[PDB]
Swiss-Prot record, chains A, D:
Protein name: Carbonic anhydrase, 25 kDa isoform
Coiled-coil region list: none
Annotated effect of mutating H104N: 100% loss of activity
Highest taxon above the source species: Eukaryota
Listed result of changing C44S: 100% loss of activity
Disulfide bonds listed in the record: none
């Protein structure tokens, strides 16, 4: 009498071990020495949006962070050491050259962001505390498309929130410095597993000659 | 350039998976009910979906530096607490597995940093300080053990600390007591290509009321 | 005045106890080996030695506001951690009982204070914030319950939170796993003159290593 | 098959309930309404020194704090909220009129204070961290009685440390204010359960006319 | 002056004001009647205190057009309420109260401040009360120039540093949250300029900033 | 870009109308500057000192900031201002420092309306204009009951007197005054009425006795 | 002066110094030769700036005896590195560097500062630039006196407050850790004094501080 | 108590030798004070101004502090100093403010030896004497190579000039100087050589033109 879950784990790793790990001694021979991913990714915890899947990332390719609604809070050593550490490690230690915040269709996190009043009353332990990061995004979307159906509405808010997060990335000095030296780039993505579509946008950043006389 | 890597890669998944399983994703798109919640490190070399061959819809994944789970704190650790509260009380997962791994950069730091009042990072030390109880233990039970050994002990014991922290969340304890939730610790050694798993038992029983 | 209260009182104990048990204290004076470690509130109305009729040498007692046990933190909670580490690893106690009690001033505060960023005390709120997970739970499961009820739920659930915090100490977990240590929560209701006790089960078991 | 410990607890409370609680309905009838102890006591956790015993304190008499080596750390909201809260509650909420720090013979805490090097190397998780509060006391005693036998030595250090703690009480504004308004008094005690003796000293504090011309 | 002394400076000031009054103020009653009520400059300019580079003249700015900050080496330090409040107050007032739409930082040829930045060792010893303390804001630009053009002749170093310093200031404008919100909201644009009065030229550049989709496959 | 264009246009106009038509002048200015004036003036877009006093290139070393304020000597907090005074006074060796205030100054308006009671509602503005608190205190003590508009005019002028006082906290400023190589003046430009007032400051030190 | 003007103030200063030089300095070569090398005053004194209460005269203090602080109402504010650094620097220098053994705070009769403390409302409105701000240090003493002697006549209020203020300052000396360590180590003693120049009297009191056994039964 | 005794003795001596022997004088002083001087002097036990300048009761309103420093006007940080100047100048209406520095001043020695490089090793001393940084900067620039003892003398005198400059940041001080109802002077007492130097400060404002 075994644990279904435990077994499910065992059989999964076994599959990985023989089909992947073993059939690629070259790869894991190096990966065992260190990592050097060019990407750092923020994706939702949501079971349906594994980043390694949707974008077919191979091992050693992307340093990943997954949290409720793929939110990137602003720089704060007392309230957001978790996020700050991942960003600081990825950008300054692994030297990623890209940061991508990926939002997705039907996000329960975003949906709660829209549904919660944020009028000083909380019905959750941490959820509201955490989704508040996207309030700006919610204000914008709600003010702009105030009469848009919730279904549509959420879609707008899922996308805006990525920009908000992107906006928050700029509160980190080492992120800004990365953009200045052009050793870093920031991008936003949107996965709609319903229509099975993907949208990718980015941040234009750099100086440009205007004229000389 | 990298924007292409991103298109091609998504195109691959589009045809090779999203399509080749219309009845699959056609269902996923309708909602989610994963039985697992996984805590794994952000290291690009240990994507849980790769290491445990998870399929979309199976696990709600939280990935952070050194796969740490801080104790209950609404002021300092909302990120974590939010995921736990969501997976447990909303998605209704049945398991929470904290997976540590060999050659963890996060744990390596925890080991080198002195935590004597001086900090040389903006966030890194603040974060991995969560694992200090594990560092304290290992250094007291395996102080004269080779560094490589120390790291493994700390990585595994760090998982244990995180399992203990999971027990500071009322709704995690409640789910354990109702046997609707199970806690597990894992350890992936991508060097020797091995994997360990262990279970945690937590229960409460009334003794008497005079 | 009060200096007298102190002399007379000590004189009483001198003859009425210290002497009337020469073979008793003659032994105590040689060392201590208490089987219990008790966490009870500083309230003058609940001295554990009175409520559970403990005799000198039976229990290593830690008394603080609202009998709270914060999680492992060498920077903010050395007082607690030191007592636990001493009782567990040095005196070798077998049990750790956290005793909450009715009409707890400490818990009452925890309930009234908003913990919304504003503080009106120097230490009081900082301290009882430890019990927030308990406040969160009770307010979500018994929000429309009469205040008196709420307090009792919070007092008992605060004990549970503290039991969970005890599990963030590696050496407490280790002792539990070796079955050399047991965790218990108690609740003294000096109003109706009743007492509850409950036990906590914690264990770890290996599952597999491929 | 019952738990010895559990049973020991049950029988203890039962004894209390019938012999004490019941045979004093007057007392607990009031005590159930609130408390108002005139004392606040700092005693060692040590099983052999229950304050309620040694000084025969009755319920409602003393607000107690027990910790390793009955140490009173100085005012610090980040490192010592535990101590600060007890002192703040006792002094400002219960209005105690006395604070007594009681040291005792053969204190493992003090003994460790003396035995530990405190040279930047720690062999404990919290013990050394916590007993350091008494370093001043240790310096004094050690410098003064450097050649005193450890047995004797410890005794000196157990007593000095109380003064150190007493010294730390003065770092709390509300304690100082209490002494200024004379609504509070500070005392030190030493219990020697070996010879079964008790020493009580206090803090002289107040203004006194010197002369008028 | 028949024995009575005269202050050249006071007289110069009086002559100048009367000239402005006659040739400009009095000849533009519409303009000045409107400016008397408020200002809505579309530009905020940072230029050097140097007496040869008055933005008014060089870019022909008219009264009401440019909210101007002038200091040694036209430097923009990073956000610091304790050390750089004058700079921060100017940007905060311009961006949030006057709602300017452009912030232009202009460096120039033969800048004495940039020359000091390059001439000073910044080796732990100072020989000025404030000059070194201030131009240290440009150390990062000095480093870049020293690395990229380490063998170049001093004068060439200066020109390079004068321009790179402008870039370092633009970088520092990004440490101001209200500036970032402006770029994000597309209500603000940042620009760098360079005035060579030796040759008689002006170079202008800008900061590209903004989201732009790459694909929706 | 409408803005880059405005900038493009402006320079070309300067180039042919001023620059190319004064080769002798720009030829000497290319070699260095020796302006007789250092001028502090508000950043306000309506009070450019070049225009108001018709200063020509090479005549005035200019500092412009919010409310034309001069903080007292402080290498830790007011390096920007100190660095300009030091450069002007010791290196370019200006002979005059003129602090010019003006009608309807927003900085002074803020100074007069902010409470300065512990709470701040700005990130830097209040912090900066606090420099003017002594002028606010004087005005309120002597004209406290006056309508706000008058209080603004009084405060704008006293704030210049406060800055002149702060210049005297720079040792090299005191020394130039003592040596008669430097002069200090305050100015007030009213762009509503279209007027200008100038006043001078006298400062000296004299040995009395040594016994 | 035959037409040449003379400064009374400068002359008063010169006359006074020459007098001190002749009658004191020159007549105490031993004393002054020793003071020229260092000072070791056993007292630190706080007295009012009031021109009528110079501690030198009133307590006949000789040069080298008392490190003195004089300010409005002889007030000792509590420890504050940001608001009260002058007071803190004097106590720190006296206690830790000069190692004085006594700190004496002396109040006095008809103190203008204490009169203002009592006359001012402290109702949210100020009418002074600094006077109210400073004497607010004595608000606690004003409260005590107003409570204990609320019906007394104004003058009586002042005398009470002048003395109580001294006590509030003694209380504030206790907010200084180095002062507390001194009392504890018995290397420092605190005293309050009161000088009535109307009647011609002096009252002195001290702070009792120290551990003292009660029993060893 | 040896100390209370010393204090007891001293007063009685004052009582019969000065107080009782000058009934006319103390009788008027009991009615109020109108000292023509306000004096800032060091707290140092060797430089009591009453002794050094032989000031009699009723002649000088005195402020004594570490290094006889006068910070600039700041109601938030330097209320103690500001309150004394305001009382002396506006209420007692003193006619002179004299700032007196002295040989071998410990405060100046600290000023010259502390680094003021971000780290402090005192709780208040460095904080307070930083007021003198401009004098330290001047001295180092003009006498930087001098032996420490000379640097101390130079800095002690320039520190008085710095305080005189800070007095000019009090509006009511500028106004008394302008109105000729107040005079400012610096002094230096050398108790090693036994000498005294006095110097005066001249300050004024004059209307130049209004057009
Ligand atoms: Cl976070
Ligand atoms: Cl977190
Ligand atoms: Cl604690
Ligand atoms: Cl504590
Ligand atoms: Cl600045
Ligand atoms: Cl500045
Ligand atoms: Cl002060
Ligand atoms: Cl002050
Ligand atoms: Cu993944
Ligand atoms: Cu007890
Ligand atoms: Cu201009
Ligand atoms: Cu004196
Ligand atoms: Zn989602
Ligand atoms: Zn890792
Ligand atoms: Zn309680
Ligand atoms: Zn003990
Ligand atoms: Zn320049
Ligand atoms: Zn203005
Ligand atoms: Zn007085
Ligand atoms: Zn001195």
């Amino acid at each position: 009498p075994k644990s279904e879950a435990s077994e499910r784990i065992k059989t999964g790793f076994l599959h990985f071990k023989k089909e992947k790990y073993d059939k690629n001694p070259a790869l894991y021979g190096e990966l065992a020495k260190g990592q050097s991913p060019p990407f750092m990714v923020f994706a939702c915890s949501d079971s349906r949006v594994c980043p390694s899947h949707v974008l077919d990332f191979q091992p050693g390719e992307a340093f990943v962070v997954r949290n409720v609604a793929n939110l990137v809070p602003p720089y704060d050593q007392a309230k957001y050491a978790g996020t700050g550490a991942a960003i600081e490690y990825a950008v300054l230690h692994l030297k990623v050259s890209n940061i991508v915040v990926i939002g997705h269709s039907a996000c329960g996190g975003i949906k709660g962001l829209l549904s919660f009043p944020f009028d000083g009353t909380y019905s959750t332990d941490f959820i509201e505390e955490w989704v508040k990061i996207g309030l700006p995004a919610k204000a914008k979307v709600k003010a702009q498309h105030g009469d848009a159906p919730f279904a549509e509405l959420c879609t707008h808010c899922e996308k805006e929130a990525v920009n908000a997060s992107l906006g928050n990335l700029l509160t980190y000095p080492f992120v800004r410095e990365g953009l200045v030296n052009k050793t870093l780039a920031l991008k936003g993505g949107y996965y709609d597993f319903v229509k099975g579509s993907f949208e990718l946008w980015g941040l234009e950043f750099g100086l440009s000659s205007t004229f000389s006389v």
